[PDB]
Amino acid sequence: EWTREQRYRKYKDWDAQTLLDLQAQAATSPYQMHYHIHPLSGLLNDPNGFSYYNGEYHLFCQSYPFGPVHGVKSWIHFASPDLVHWHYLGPAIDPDSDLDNAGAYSGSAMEHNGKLLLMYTGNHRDEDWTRIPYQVIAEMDENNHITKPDAAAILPPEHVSEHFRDPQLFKHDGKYYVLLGAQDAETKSGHIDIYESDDLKTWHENGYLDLGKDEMGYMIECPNLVFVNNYPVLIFCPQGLDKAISDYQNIYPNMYWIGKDINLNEAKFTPLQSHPANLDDGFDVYATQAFNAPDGNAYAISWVGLPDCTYPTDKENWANCYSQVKRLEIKDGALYQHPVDAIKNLRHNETQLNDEKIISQKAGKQYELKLYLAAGQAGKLHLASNDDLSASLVIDFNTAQDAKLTIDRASSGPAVNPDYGATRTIGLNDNEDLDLDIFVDGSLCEIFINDGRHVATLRFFARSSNQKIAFDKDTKYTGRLWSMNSIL
């Protein structure tokens, strides 16, 4: 319903009373998250500049503060000591210059000689509304104050279309690299384009990273390389990916691909996995960003929200939130994802669980449910449920001869992008035990499966009185239920 004109009206052409009203509307929503990052107002999307700098973790965010739509984008800024307790540092990069006049699009952060370089795509629209993407290196100092250059670091080359964006800047092998999402101008295929520099002033093209002969969609958004247990891992968003390469049910997938090795100078990637895999088996994770932290861990955080999609909270004038931070691990040839240790600080009111069918008549809106379920069983676990289990988030499990998990949100509340399905299925190994570590926060659910082997993340919109947690059958299991304190 918003016009192009309305989406690109400048922030100075909105009044401050409207913005204050919008902050109240977002914060007091009955569906707001309160231990995950959420917009102060308007729409949140792609994590940006995820980093460690000046003694704390930093995280920036694509933001449009005036409504539940992809209006003209800015970066806003959060920091944390522990990847859990975030505090707001305000807007960081506005669409206020020629280079980014129609948006400060996504990007990354790299420490350099005591400053934090923020490299991002200036979404420029020229006099005719032709998009010209510019790669810009801004600079943040130790007071979190940001300066912008007057000139781009990388001008759009001839071989790419208008889609050329989301730079990842980092140091590796003694030099500087930039990875960019790209659509080839002639084939219209998605690529990760490689740039290298020895000084950050002159950039050299190394070409598209060789991901094999098969096309990777028509565009790759938000490319990421991180080293996880010494393996090069790609995390990226290949829009239009052929489902023959990998199944997925979201409108656009967020894939990962573990390599045995990578050579950015020669644009070479030796895959460990024969195929890329879904980072998240759920309903809503997109634009995930990751970085290698000084503590030797690789951390990732996801936008929970999909482009070209809508949500029942749209009428509340705000949209989406972030996943919790996930610590990455390579195990058995796959990517595992784990809650960070600090998230346990939110826990309180611990309850021991052993075979009780009804886990809680009324669990609250914020909790962590950690379960161990014996092999050889089938049933349903209902979350955010009414009393008779007819309206809930359903985890339909089988740990017996056709083992699998089906997550079904159809009955949880109003429909959520139903054209892309009300269920998601995760295959399980037959006759094996099952672990679940389930985080519920307002209209967000995160289901960590078999100790991080799979993660299923989703929005759901249950009426506030639907807070029951219960199995439908007598189920043999042990577990713990904790309330989780509001911090955001």
Is 46 among the annotated ligand-binding positions? yes
**Pairing assessment for the beta strands 378-385 and 393-398 based on DSSP bridges:** antiparallel
Where does residue 23 rank: exposed (0-12), middle (13-18), buried (19+ CB within 10 A)? middle
Pick one of a second copy, Na ion, none as the site partner of residue 82 (Cβ within 5 to 8 A by kind).
a second copy
Window contacting a second copy (CB under 8 A); options: 80-88, 161-169, 414-422, 442-450:
80-88
Distance CA 88, CA 59 (A): 10
In sequence order, what are the residues at sequence separation of 6 or more whose Cβ sits closer than 8 angstroms to the Cβ of residue 131? 102, 123, 124, 125, 162
96 is catalytic: no
> Does residue number 416 form part of the binding site for Na ion (CB under 5 A)?
yes
277: helix, strand or coil = strand
Q: Which of 422, 430, 435, 482 binds Na ion (CB under 5 A)?
A: 422
> Does residue number 315 form part of the binding site for a second copy (CB under 8 A)?
no
CA neighbor of 99 nearest in space, from 135, 49, 74, 63: 135
Distance CA 416, CA 424 (A): 13
Q: Which of 14, 203, 218, 420 binds a second copy (CB under 8 A)?
A: 14
Laid out side by side, the sheet with 204-208 consists of 160-172, 175-184, 190-197, 204-208
Our CA dihedral for 328, 330, 332, 336, rounded to 10 degrees, sits at: 10
Per-residue binding string, a second copy, 146-185, x by CB under 8 A, is ----------------------------------------
Distance CA 420, CA 321 (A): 20
Q: Which residue is nearest to Na ion (CB)?
A: 422
Distance CA 255, CA 273 (A): 12
Q: One of 46, 184, 280, 437 is an active-site residue; which one? A: 46
Q: Report the nearest approach of a second copy to the CB of residue 121 (Å).
A: 21
Q: Which of 114, 127, 130, 145 binds a second copy (CB under 8 A)?
A: 145
What would the two tokens of residue 332 be?
């058995």
Residue with Cβ nearer Na ion (181 or 282): 282
Residue with Cβ nearer a second copy (89 or 410): 89
Is 73 among the annotated ligand-binding positions? yes
Q: Report the nearest approach of a second copy to the CB of residue 385 (Å).
A: 20
Residue with Cβ nearer a second copy (87 or 275): 87
What would the two tokens of residue 344 be?
């346990």
Is 45 among the annotated ligand-binding positions? yes
What would the two tokens of residue 100 be?
């980014």
What would the two tokens of residue 145 be?
């104050």
Q: Which of 7, 54, 69, 80 binds a second copy (CB under 8 A)?
A: 80
**Pairing assessment for the beta strands 378-385 and 131-140 based on DSSP bridges:** unpaired
Window contacting a second copy (CB under 8 A); options: 72-80, 192-200, 218-226, 455-463:
72-80
Q: Report the nearest approach of a second copy to the CB of residue 168 (Å).
A: 25
> Does residue number 17 form part of the binding site for a second copy (CB under 8 A)?
yes
4: helix, strand or coil = helix
Phi-psi group of 211: left, alpha or beta (phi > 0 → left; psi -120 to 50 → alpha; rest → beta):
alpha
Pick one of Na ion, a second copy, none as the site partner of residue 85 (Cβ within 5 to 8 A by kind).
a second copy
Residue with Cβ nearer Na ion (41 or 250): 250
> Does residue number 425 form part of the binding site for a second copy (CB under 8 A)?
no
Per-residue binding string, a second copy, 341-380, x by CB under 8 A, is ----x--x--------------------------------
How far, CA to CA in Å, does 399 sit from each of 381, 452, 455, 461?
13, 17, 17, 28
Pick one of Na ion, a second copy, none as the site partner of residue 297 (Cβ within 5 to 8 A by kind).
Na ion
What would the two tokens of residue 94 be?
């506005």
Distance CA 477, CA 373 (A): 4
Residue matched to tokens 């991901």:
211
Window contacting Na ion (CB under 5 A); options: 23-31, 56-64, 106-114, 292-300:
292-300
Instruction: State the number of binding residues for Na ion (CB under 5 A).
Output: 3
466: helix, strand or coil = coil
Per-residue binding string, a second copy, 87-106, x by CB under 8 A, is xxxxxx-x------------
In sequence order, what are the residues at sequence separation of 6 or more whose Cβ sits closer than 8 angstroms to the Cβ of residue 253? 237, 238, 241, 246, 278
Residue matched to tokens 């892309």:
420
Q: Which residues are annotated as a binding site for beta-D-fructose?
A: 45-46, 73, 106, 165-166, 221
Binding residues vs a second copy (CB under 8 A): 10-21, 23-30, 34, 40, 56, 65-66, 74, 77, 79-82, 85, 87-92, 94, 143-145, 345, 348, 485-488
Q: Which residues are annotated as a binding site?
A: 45-46, 73, 106, 165-166, 221
Give the catalytic positions in this structure.
Answer: 46
